Scaffold this active site. Structure first.
Site, PDB file in Angstrom:
ATOM      1  N   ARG A 215       0.799  -1.214   0.000  1.00  0.00           N
ATOM      2  CA  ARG A 215       0.000   0.000   0.000  1.00  0.00           C
ATOM      3  C   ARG A 215       0.855   1.300   0.000  1.00  0.00           C
ATOM      4  O   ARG A 215       1.740   1.476  -0.842  1.00  0.00           O
ATOM      5  CB  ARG A 215      -0.969  -0.107   1.167  1.00  0.00           C
ATOM      6  CG  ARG A 215      -1.960  -1.255   1.030  1.00  0.00           C
ATOM      7  CD  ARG A 215      -2.645  -1.670   2.318  1.00  0.00           C
ATOM      8  NE  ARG A 215      -3.443  -0.614   2.996  1.00  0.00           N
ATOM      9  CZ  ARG A 215      -4.712  -0.252   2.699  1.00  0.00           C
ATOM     10  NH1 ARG A 215      -5.381  -0.832   1.700  1.00  0.00           N
ATOM     11  NH2 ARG A 215      -5.329   0.711   3.435  1.00  0.00           N
TER      12      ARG A 215
ATOM     13  N   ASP B  50      -2.610  12.210   9.849  1.00  0.00           N
ATOM     14  CA  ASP B  50      -3.946  11.911   9.494  1.00  0.00           C
ATOM     15  C   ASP B  50      -4.680  13.238   9.325  1.00  0.00           C
ATOM     16  O   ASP B  50      -4.802  13.977  10.292  1.00  0.00           O
ATOM     17  CB  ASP B  50      -4.574  11.102  10.583  1.00  0.00           C
ATOM     18  CG  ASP B  50      -6.040  10.933  10.406  1.00  0.00           C
ATOM     19  OD1 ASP B  50      -6.623  11.197   9.314  1.00  0.00           O
ATOM     20  OD2 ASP B  50      -6.643  10.572  11.426  1.00  0.00           O
TER      21      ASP B  50
ATOM     22  N   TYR C  51      -6.339   5.149  18.440  1.00  0.00           N
ATOM     23  CA  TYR C  51      -5.730   5.440  17.195  1.00  0.00           C
ATOM     24  C   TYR C  51      -5.503   6.943  17.083  1.00  0.00           C
ATOM     25  O   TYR C  51      -4.429   7.426  16.652  1.00  0.00           O
ATOM     26  CB  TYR C  51      -6.616   4.921  16.032  1.00  0.00           C
ATOM     27  CG  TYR C  51      -6.187   5.452  14.709  1.00  0.00           C
ATOM     28  CD1 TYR C  51      -5.086   4.919  14.070  1.00  0.00           C
ATOM     29  CD2 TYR C  51      -6.854   6.482  14.103  1.00  0.00           C
ATOM     30  CE1 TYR C  51      -4.616   5.444  12.892  1.00  0.00           C
ATOM     31  CE2 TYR C  51      -6.429   7.007  12.894  1.00  0.00           C
ATOM     32  CZ  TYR C  51      -5.301   6.462  12.294  1.00  0.00           C
ATOM     33  OH  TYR C  51      -4.843   6.924  11.081  1.00  0.00           O
TER      34      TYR C  51
ATOM     35  N   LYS D 168      -2.175   9.381  16.621  1.00  0.00           N
ATOM     36  CA  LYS D 168      -1.875  10.294  15.513  1.00  0.00           C
ATOM     37  C   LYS D 168      -1.733  11.723  15.974  1.00  0.00           C
ATOM     38  O   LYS D 168      -1.015  12.506  15.365  1.00  0.00           O
ATOM     39  CB  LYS D 168      -2.968  10.207  14.463  1.00  0.00           C
ATOM     40  CG  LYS D 168      -3.025   8.900  13.709  1.00  0.00           C
ATOM     41  CD  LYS D 168      -1.695   8.704  12.920  1.00  0.00           C
ATOM     42  CE  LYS D 168      -1.797   7.727  11.787  1.00  0.00           C
ATOM     43  NZ  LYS D 168      -0.479   7.369  11.249  1.00  0.00           N
TER      44      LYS D 168
HETATM   45  N1  LIG Z   1      -5.081   4.598   3.884  1.00  0.00           N
HETATM   46  C1  LIG Z   1      -5.696   5.734   4.344  1.00  0.00           C
HETATM   47  O1  LIG Z   1      -6.840   6.025   3.979  1.00  0.00           O
HETATM   48  C2  LIG Z   1      -5.024   6.598   5.389  1.00  0.00           C
HETATM   49  C3  LIG Z   1      -5.736   7.623   6.066  1.00  0.00           C
HETATM   50  C4  LIG Z   1      -5.138   8.401   7.056  1.00  0.00           C
HETATM   51  C5  LIG Z   1      -3.822   8.134   7.383  1.00  0.00           C
HETATM   52  N2  LIG Z   1      -3.143   7.120   6.766  1.00  0.00           N
HETATM   53  C6  LIG Z   1      -1.750   6.860   7.192  1.00  0.00           C
HETATM   54  O2  LIG Z   1      -0.843   6.625   6.089  1.00  0.00           O
HETATM   55  C7  LIG Z   1       0.110   5.603   6.461  1.00  0.00           C
HETATM   56  C8  LIG Z   1       0.042   4.483   5.440  1.00  0.00           C
HETATM   57  O3  LIG Z   1      -1.346   4.056   5.332  1.00  0.00           O
HETATM   58  P1  LIG Z   1      -1.825   2.527   4.860  1.00  0.00           P
HETATM   59  O4  LIG Z   1      -3.329   2.398   4.759  1.00  0.00           O
HETATM   60  O5  LIG Z   1      -0.867   2.083   3.734  1.00  0.00           O
HETATM   61  O6  LIG Z   1      -1.435   1.746   6.220  1.00  0.00           O
HETATM   62  P2  LIG Z   1      -1.790   0.158   6.529  1.00  0.00           P
HETATM   63  O7  LIG Z   1      -1.671  -0.570   5.191  1.00  0.00           O
HETATM   64  O8  LIG Z   1      -3.016   0.149   7.407  1.00  0.00           O
HETATM   65  O9  LIG Z   1      -0.496  -0.157   7.458  1.00  0.00           O
HETATM   66  C9  LIG Z   1       0.798  -0.062   6.860  1.00  0.00           C
HETATM   67  C10 LIG Z   1       1.721  -1.091   7.486  1.00  0.00           C
HETATM   68  O10 LIG Z   1       1.878  -0.851   8.887  1.00  0.00           O
HETATM   69  C11 LIG Z   1       2.518  -2.012   9.378  1.00  0.00           C
HETATM   70  N3  LIG Z   1       2.168  -2.348  10.761  1.00  0.00           N
HETATM   71  C12 LIG Z   1       0.943  -2.520  11.352  1.00  0.00           C
HETATM   72  N4  LIG Z   1       1.093  -2.964  12.632  1.00  0.00           N
HETATM   73  C13 LIG Z   1       2.420  -3.004  12.881  1.00  0.00           C
HETATM   74  C14 LIG Z   1       3.286  -3.416  14.010  1.00  0.00           C
HETATM   75  N5  LIG Z   1       2.757  -3.794  15.177  1.00  0.00           N
HETATM   76  N6  LIG Z   1       4.623  -3.431  13.790  1.00  0.00           N
HETATM   77  C15 LIG Z   1       5.163  -3.037  12.597  1.00  0.00           C
HETATM   78  N7  LIG Z   1       4.432  -2.646  11.520  1.00  0.00           N
HETATM   79  C16 LIG Z   1       3.107  -2.650  11.626  1.00  0.00           C
HETATM   80  C17 LIG Z   1       2.051  -3.236   8.519  1.00  0.00           C
HETATM   81  O11 LIG Z   1       3.133  -4.062   8.046  1.00  0.00           O
HETATM   82  P3  LIG Z   1       2.974  -5.645   7.662  1.00  0.00           P
HETATM   83  O12 LIG Z   1       1.945  -5.544   6.527  1.00  0.00           O
HETATM   84  O13 LIG Z   1       4.367  -5.948   7.276  1.00  0.00           O
HETATM   85  O14 LIG Z   1       2.512  -6.332   8.951  1.00  0.00           O
HETATM   86  C18 LIG Z   1       1.263  -2.572   7.384  1.00  0.00           C
HETATM   87  O15 LIG Z   1       1.434  -3.219   6.107  1.00  0.00           O
HETATM   88  C19 LIG Z   1      -0.291   5.184   7.879  1.00  0.00           C
HETATM   89  O16 LIG Z   1       0.498   5.800   8.886  1.00  0.00           O
HETATM   90  C20 LIG Z   1      -1.734   5.610   8.068  1.00  0.00           C
HETATM   91  O17 LIG Z   1      -2.176   5.747   9.475  1.00  0.00           O
HETATM   92  C21 LIG Z   1      -3.717   6.351   5.827  1.00  0.00           C
HETATM   93  N1  LIG Z   2      -3.190   2.643   9.210  1.00  0.00           N
HETATM   94  C1  LIG Z   2      -4.233   3.351   8.786  1.00  0.00           C
HETATM   95  N2  LIG Z   2      -4.499   4.561   9.252  1.00  0.00           N
HETATM   96  N3  LIG Z   2      -5.662   5.182   8.743  1.00  0.00           N
HETATM   97  C2  LIG Z   2      -6.325   4.483   7.816  1.00  0.00           C
HETATM   98  N4  LIG Z   2      -7.430   4.898   7.203  1.00  0.00           N
HETATM   99  C3  LIG Z   2      -8.310   3.947   6.570  1.00  0.00           C
HETATM  100  C4  LIG Z   2      -9.696   4.553   6.377  1.00  0.00           C
HETATM  101  C5  LIG Z   2     -10.867   4.137   6.893  1.00  0.00           C
HETATM  102  C6  LIG Z   2     -11.908   4.876   6.478  1.00  0.00           C
HETATM  103  C7  LIG Z   2     -11.563   5.874   5.669  1.00  0.00           C
HETATM  104  S1  LIG Z   2      -9.870   5.767   5.478  1.00  0.00           S
HETATM  105  S2  LIG Z   2      -5.470   2.906   7.578  1.00  0.00           S
END
Ligand SMILES: NC(=O)c1ccc[n+]([C@@H]2O[C@H](COP(=O)([O-])OP(=O)(O)OC[C@H]3O[C@@H](n4cnc5c(N)ncnc54)[C@H](OP(=O)(O)O)[C@@H]3O)[C@@H](O)[C@H]2O)c1
Ligand SMILES: Nc1nnc(NCc2cccs2)s1
Ligand SMILES: NC(=O)c1ccc[n+]([C@@H]2O[C@H](COP(=O)([O-])OP(=O)(O)OC[C@H]3O[C@@H](n4cnc5c(N)ncnc54)[C@H](OP(=O)(O)O)[C@@H]3O)[C@@H](O)[C@H]2O)c1
Ligand SMILES: NC(=O)c1ccc[n+]([C@@H]2O[C@H](COP(=O)([O-])OP(=O)(O)OC[C@H]3O[C@@H](n4cnc5c(N)ncnc54)[C@H](OP(=O)(O)O)[C@@H]3O)[C@@H](O)[C@H]2O)c1
Ligand SMILES: NC(=O)c1ccc[n+]([C@@H]2O[C@H](COP(=O)([O-])OP(=O)(O)OC[C@H]3O[C@@H](n4cnc5c(N)ncnc54)[C@H](OP(=O)(O)O)[C@@H]3O)[C@@H](O)[C@H]2O)c1
Ligand SMILES: Nc1nnc(NCc2cccs2)s1
Ligand SMILES: Nc1nnc(NCc2cccs2)s1
Ligand SMILES: Nc1nnc(NCc2cccs2)s1
Lengths: 248, 241, 249, 247
Positions: A13, A141, A154, A158
């Site tokens: 991702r 976030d 969570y 953040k």
């Molecule tokens: N996606 C969104 O909509 C969104 C929204 C707001 C903020 N963000 C932020 O953007 C960043 C990337 O987002 P994303 O959706 O790509 O994140 P994600 O796929 O939910 O998590 C990214 C990676 O974090 C690692 N992780 C989880 N638990 C862990 C632990 N205990 N130790 C070490 N690693 C761990 C995992 O690695 P493994 O797979 O190797 O276990 C996972 O693949 C994050 O900080 C997230 O909070 C994302």
């Molecule tokens: N690790 C992650 N942090 N925040 C995330 N957001 C996922 C979403 C859930 C609903 C809208 S975005 S995954």
């Protein structure tokens, strides 16, 4: 001659798109992962096929515990072992799940506050102690002040990461380390989420009624680490398509 | 005709010039707006047209609020369409800056400080949108908006209003694919005590560093970014009293 | 002697509730009004019937113009003419209507929306400070100032400017002992113009009880801020929004 | 039937003032303390001399650990056992010291993130589970202009903002309000020399002095009162304009 970067949670991702785009830009990368061993190794394979000896993997649990400092020390140390330097830290890894006020709670606290905040602090300390355009980018976030209902822990994590971003920008500026953030709104939706819920979220976004690609997030990371952001520290760039602007 | 085009207000000097130059270097055609700095505006336009001919025009206008400001703002946008056949980017850079202690008539101060800083940006934004692909607006904001200079109430009101416009216009124009963002300098080019307060290297930002953030926000690397304000302040805003 | 307060747009709604609550706490009040003359006079009468010589009215347009400074100076002057002092300024009057980016001229809308919501508060603040104990100013802000209604750009600019004023003036007048704070409703008394069904849409958004703030609830926060219990508070804007500003889209 | 309040870190300084002013408003109080037993008991005695059986003390370490959840549950339970109800939670206790980036670091994490953030979360959950109900968290007006080298402390206080907002939103359907008070400079450290105290005082626009404990307490009394019945998720600065002052 090439700089080097650590990206946490870089197997899949957004972190993966970050590592890829860093590598495309010139960087050698440490691909940190926890469980996603096949994806991590397969990314490193793809990268080293492009430029040999430019990618390594590093396995670690980022849950808080009394060995977390050592794990964080090891992630940084792995960058120095493979590449002789460490120019960029990307704090991307993140646990995300609900913790209603009304797994033990201490495990939830360790996972949600550890990964999202304590590990970034520890990584930041180790990055700094081991030390040019040095910088750290934290994945924050955009919705940190309009949180998901029942995600207290969570959200606490953040929020703390904002605090870290600012405190570390201030403290490390005398050493020429910049510290910034990139704050996604709705980017790649949880694999777990059904497609009706995904379009619900998509439909909230003023700019295009769609989520951010992982590449769109990475682009902001790339800017922040680049020479076009040399005077930027303590800034958190929202990459949210305006979602944070939208009232209830 | 496939080269996009930008309007930059207050482009004759300092940060606006740097923004105009850097846009032009990225391949934009530019409208160099000016109020008093005709010689400088033209000299920049000369330099840019020597690089690539017929890529730079100038446009004179007082951005003070008055009954004729809406027409002036509409004509600035028109000049981009007249010269270049399109208007892809609006940079709201012009700004009046001076103290207005609470303890020139006050209404003139209102007209220049709120007019140039907020009302002209609002009117330009309206004309830009009415006339309409990577369309965006960038507003020049202030990193110290919430830790303002003492006795600068009207200036600060105007820069706060500009945050408001940035956010409101981002929301309202997102359906048109027009992104609206901000760049917030701390201390850039001074109009030494100040330099020493900056965490990141005890120096002001060059104009080029400000421009770099603008270039990012107009680029295809920011195609999902709207309603964001990027501080370019070397950490200054993080520094307690 | 009793302290005295100016409340702008005090004839009705939140401004009236503020003037009433200030008067109940012991203030003499200037009820400023623009168009609502019957309602203002009627309010002064009621208050004066509870205590003689404790309410006057003062009419003014707070649209920006070259005479706005005189009008704002006259408001403050009215309070010194009536009561020999002016302890509190509540900047409550507000114009509110859409101004789509994509009727009145735009220069009129600017004048009304920026004039009432920002410029008149600045001039009133200037006058209040220059005409000079627990002296303070309370500005009626907007809790949704960073999640604005779509097509409300000028209104929103004005409310943002007022935040700026709140902060700049708190900074600058702190040395003179004058505090400057704000009170920021989310959804309070809905527009009279609005139909019930549109009202209930807004009500339903509010986590805390799924209803709008009463005028009294807004006024309570003003009363705290002017009180001796807020002696160290300056430059603070208190949301009175039942959690609305925290709710994502 | 008098309502009841838990105040953490209530033996001294700001917490003490909160407990006193709550007691003066008609509240029965649980005075929580960690190391300051003699001060906590003396406050309880003073308050009981004023009205019998209106103050109890409750000892507990609010450092994060495996037993923190049970500790926090016990604090809340002590209010119900003493007084039959728990109307107000004030999260006031706080560890505060520098943690430079360049005690073990995990102990620092446990103390700084535990007292300032995890313990309020746990307390909040126990408070809510057991139900004019409200929680007030002691935040920090300088959270976005932090003291250099206080990363963990600042992280804890930012997390508390998030708690305050998240709990406001989640608890609003149960009629529990959740707010903050954010001091700028209030009571200075016991050991700090006056000349150092004066550097801080001189920064404050409003009177060039720190807030009294009572002044901070006044804002807490407002937020728990009937005059704040529609206020939730709000953080009131009680800082004399300090947060508005540029470098
Ligand atoms: N996606 C969104 O909509 C969104 C929204 C707001 C903020 N963000 C932020 O953007 C960043 C990337 O987002 P994303 O959706 O790509 O994140 P994600 O796929 O939910 O998590 C990214 C990676 O974090 C690692 N992780 C989880 N638990 C862990 C632990 N205990 N130790 C070490 N690693 C761990 C995992 O690695 P493994 O797979 O190797 O276990 C996972 O693949 C994050 O900080 C997230 O909070 C994302
Ligand atoms: N690790 C992650 N942090 N925040 C995330 N957001 C996922 C979403 C859930 C609903 C809208 S975005 S995954
Ligand atoms: N430099 C800094 O430290 C700093 C700090 C915070 C924010 N900013 C923001 O960054 C942007 C550029 O900064 P700067 O220092 O380059 O700006 P500046 O030199 O103060 O002003 C830029 C231009 O604005 C134009 N302008 C002023 N009054 C005008 C009026 N009544 N009508 C029309 N144009 C008018 C002038 O054009 P003519 O010369 O043609 O008359 C002027 O050269 C501004 O928006 C500013 O507020 C800068
Ligand atoms: N109601 C809400 O839900 C809500 C939400 C967010 C913020 N607020 C803020 O809280 C405050 C009170 O709200 P409200 O709904 O009671 O206000 P409102 O009824 O919309 O307006 C208050 C008064 O403003 C005065 N006013 C309007 N235009 C004026 C002008 N050009 N010159 C002088 N006075 C003028 C009017 O006086 P006359 O009647 O005498 O003409 C009017 O009665 C406002 O500042 C508002 O922005 C309210
Ligand atoms: N003073 C200020 O200027 C200022 C400024 C910004 C924010 N604040 C906030 O306002 C609140 C009160 O300030 P203050 O200066 O009165 O606080 P303080 O005296 O530093 O701390 C209050 C109490 O916290 C308790 N505490 C510390 N570590 C603990 C632990 N591990 N377990 C349980 N309790 C623990 C202590 O209890 P025992 O004494 O019983 O051991 C202490 O008396 C705090 O949340 C603080 O962060 C204060
Ligand atoms: N037009 C202008 N808006 N803001 C400006 N800031 C210039 C300053 C730089 C450092 C102290 S004041 S110029
Ligand atoms: N003057 C006014 N400012 N803000 C007001 N709010 C009215 C509302 C309209 C929709 C929800 S509340 S009136
Ligand atoms: N527990 C505490 N949190 N914050 C505190 N502040 C004390 C000081 C405030 C300003 C200089 S020292 S004690």
């Amino acid at each position: 001659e090439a700089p080097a970067a650590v990206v946490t949670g870089a197997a899949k991702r957004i972190g993966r798109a970050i590592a890829v785009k860093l590598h495309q830009t010139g960087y050698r990368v440490v691909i940190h992962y926890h469980n996603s061993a096949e994806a991590a190794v397969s990314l490193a394979d793809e990268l080293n096929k492009e430029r040999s000896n430019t990618a390594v993997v590093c396995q670690a649990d980022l849950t808080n515990s009394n060995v977390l400092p050592a794990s964080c020390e090891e992630i940084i140390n792995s960058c120095f072992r493979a590449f002789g330097r460490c120019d960029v830290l990307v704090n991307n890894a993140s646990a995300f799940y609900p913790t209603p006020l009304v797994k033990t709670v201490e495990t939830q606290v360790a996972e949600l506050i550890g990964t999202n905040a304590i590990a970034p602090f520890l990584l930041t300390m180790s990055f700094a102690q081991r030390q040019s355009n040095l910088s750290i980018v934290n994945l924050c976030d955009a919705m940190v002040d309009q949180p998901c209902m029942a995600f207290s822990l969570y959200n606490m994590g953040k929020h703390a990461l904002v605090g870290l971003t600012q405190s570390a920008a201030l403290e490390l500026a005398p050493y020429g380390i910049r510290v910034n953030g990139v704050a996604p709104g709705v980017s790649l939706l949880p694999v777990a989420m059904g497609e009706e819920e995904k379009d619900k979220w998509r439909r909230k976004v003023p700019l295009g009624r769609r989520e951010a690609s992982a590449e769109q997030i990475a682009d902001a990371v790339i800017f922040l680490v680049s020479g076009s952001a040399q005077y930027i520290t303590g800034s958190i760039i929202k990459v949210d398509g305006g979602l944070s602007l939208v009232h209830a």
